[PDB]
Amino acid sequence: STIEEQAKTFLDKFNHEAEDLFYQSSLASWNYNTNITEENVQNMNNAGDKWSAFLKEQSTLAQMYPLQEIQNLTVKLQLQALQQNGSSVLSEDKSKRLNTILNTMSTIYSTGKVCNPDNPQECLLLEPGLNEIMANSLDYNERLWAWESWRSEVGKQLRPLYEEYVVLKNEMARANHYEDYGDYWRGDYEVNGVDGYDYSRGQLIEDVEHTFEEIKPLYEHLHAYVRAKLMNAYPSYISPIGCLPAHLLGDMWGRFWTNLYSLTVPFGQKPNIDVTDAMVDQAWDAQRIFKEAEKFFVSVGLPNMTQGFWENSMLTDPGNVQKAVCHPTAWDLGKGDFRILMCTKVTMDDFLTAHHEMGHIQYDMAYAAQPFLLRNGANEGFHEAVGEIMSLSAATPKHLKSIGLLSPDFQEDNETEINFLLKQALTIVGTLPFTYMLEKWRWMVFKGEIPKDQWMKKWWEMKREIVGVVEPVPHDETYCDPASLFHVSNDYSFIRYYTRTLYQFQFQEALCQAAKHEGPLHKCDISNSTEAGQKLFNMLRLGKSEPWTLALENVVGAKNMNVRPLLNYFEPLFTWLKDQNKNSFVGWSTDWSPYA
Amino acid sequence: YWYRLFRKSKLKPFERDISTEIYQAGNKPCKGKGPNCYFPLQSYGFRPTYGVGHQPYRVVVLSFELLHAPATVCGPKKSTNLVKNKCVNFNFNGLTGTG
């Protein structure tokens, strides 16, 4: 006769309907992903349409129960997930316009190609053209040509579309009793209810600013070292004190700095660790790699793979008879169906990717007991962090020596550790400012502090002030540079990566401390340590049923984001950089530009 | 294969219900589905590729007893061979002796 009982019954019905519908959709999607055939596409389309129709029908009936009359803090989260008007607040024509504009943007981004001047019959599409050039070329004019071209052909065909996209998304956000679309995305971290763990939507900005204010010295030293080393490959293109050009960062946009290892290696004479020859000399296969990964995961006390996973999940490419999409992915079809889809080769990179995917599968398997609506991570950053901690822990030389893939007489020196630390730093430390700046610019644009005619005047201005990169050619308001990315042209958030990177090192430090480890953090293996696994389990099985602050506190011991473990992980590299660059200058000035 | 989900009461040992009337959840009187008026019957979705915890189990709950009765059809008894011209302990249909 109350409202709580009616809400409970409604969720009870929805829980049993959604399971069957979602399982049908997921099975159809997997069947399509295995092959490439017309009837599979037809089945996938039918299943997806049915699932979307059911979800839309069930969303409407959930608004009858007021949110203020229910005090349970568990069904309230599910109702809040269901009571959300998706895009129906506006009129039908506006919704149709929004769907059309999104589809047009996606189509424009997907099928964009650039042609070499005076050669209309030779056009490349980035994967083996621009981005390949971007990743494996030491020339100067070619890199600048590709970098300017791709943006010139793509961004101007997306900017007018993006203006209407922003306007309509703001309209929908205000219709949904929010401030803007940026507030709509920041709401993922919002926690209301139980006292002592509240997290307002506006606290995220302050937390991110405070945490980033501490990373600056290490990034400054790394930037100075990279700038000093790159003056040997481009002698007359890098300022002694200026900012690094964005077209010489080994990537189309500068997201990662991994492709600069061959230019900035400290000791090129001593080789790195590569067990590919050991893998080949003992006749290893994909099954052996996967069973070794399973052994590593069971070494810490976690459960192992279900029998069906060894049957329904493909491990190697079928060949020319079939046609699949080789892309690693952990599939949770529901109702006890967990699968891995990856084409495996005998290589160390696959040896680490297997661990990453199996960590994904373990995390998915952890929270199978929770209701359907709560079967996800605490936030949008826990999942990849749990995946990556195992990958970081499994590459230690001690583990390689223990499993017999390395010579027992290989005397590990204090010179290879610097190489490994630098290689890890170039791909971990060098991406946080980029993500932070992109999210800050997007939030400022959505909020309204930046008028429509002052977009790019800020976009290149923040770069020089944060990332230390300068545009090689001037730009006007016609360009839309951020839309060239996959996560900007298509509607996707970007603050996931910063939080994931900050969480992974904190978790690693907590586990290493719990494992009674003595020495530097970079030589830590969580193998043969039960105490290092059970603690992690306390976070694995919670899911979305509890605020992310409580989940983080259950492992690390602190309820707020922290950065000290990240700097502790790179301490000897920091000392070596401090010793090396005593005769150089740290810092950058925003006055030098390549074009002026 | 179907199973009950909603009912406005609890069950008692050895009770069976076949009712198909719609279940009421609100104050207003009900005629047909639509609003808070759900059908109290939902089916399973068994598939051969489910996990161990979701695959169908044929469960004979031998909740058997009801022993007492004018009749007592019985479990089966073992018999052995027969020996003659010798001193043995015999049991014939409950008649027990020696000779």
Ligand SMILES: *[C@@H]1O[C@H](CO)[C@@H](O)[C@H](O)[C@H]1NC(C)=O
């Ligand atoms: C995949 O394709 C092959 C031939 O193209 C066909 O024999 C097989 O049944 C297909 N399987 C699925 C799941 O579509």
Ligand SMILES: *[C@@H]1O[C@H](CO)[C@@H](O)[C@H](O)[C@H]1NC(C)=O
């Ligand atoms: C909230 O409801 C759940 C079941 O939906 C129950 O387990 C829990 O005890 C309830 N909360 C309180 C404080 O009783």
Ligand SMILES: *[C@@H]1O[C@H](CO)[C@@H](O)[C@H](O)[C@H]1NC(C)=O
């Ligand atoms: C949006 O949600 C409100 C309740 O918050 C509801 O009254 C309104 O009809 C909804 N609009 C839709 C579903 O388009």
Ligand SMILES: *[C@@H]1O[C@H](CO)[C@@H](O)[C@H](O)[C@H]1NC(C)=O
């Ligand atoms: C790990 O996998 C092995 C191989 O089947 C199995 O015997 C063992 O029970 C697994 N460990 C756990 C904790 O499930």
Ligand SMILES: *[C@@H]1O[C@H](CO)[C@@H](O)[C@H](O)[C@H]1NC(C)=O
């Ligand atoms: C873990 O312990 C086992 C059993 O003693 C041992 O064989 C293995 O080498 C150990 N692994 C590591 C990484 O020390």
Ligand SMILES: *[C@@H]1O[C@H](CO)[C@@H](O)[C@H](O)[C@H]1NC(C)=O
């Ligand atoms: C390694 O140890 C040696 C000890 O002789 C020391 O001279 C050197 O500075 C240390 N660091 C590197 C990077 O070699």
Ligand SMILES: [Zn+2]
């Ligand atoms: Zn991953």
